[PDB]
């Protein structure tokens, strides 16, 4: 167990080492939260 | 006859009804009509 679970966890830290890119960002124009500079998910707003 | 609320809009646009005196109505669906627009993005004119 002690092998099968921590080669799980080298294949949870190879599958995860990515660069943190930002996307866009607008300003919120609707009343939520008014002005904030929201993550502009434009695509897909099933994300957002 | 329950509940008065109060609407804090600082400034607002205005759309006015004129009617006539000797014809009863009630105002609910003049109103009603500008709740059905509401959404967070924005406010249609009030109906007085």
Known sequence: LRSNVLLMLLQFTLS???INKSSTFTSDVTTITSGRMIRAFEGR???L | GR???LVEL???V???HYYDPQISLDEAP???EWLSK???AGIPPVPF
């Open chain 2, 10 to 12: 600082g400034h607002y």
């Open chain 1, 16 to 18: 995860n080492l990515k």
């Open chain 2, 30 to 32: 003049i109103l009603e």
């Open chain 2, 38 to 40: 509401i959404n967070p």
């Open chain 1, 45 to 47: 707003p099933e994300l």
């Open chain 2, 3 to 5: 509940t008065r609320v």
């Open chain 2, 14 to 16: 205005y759309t006015l």
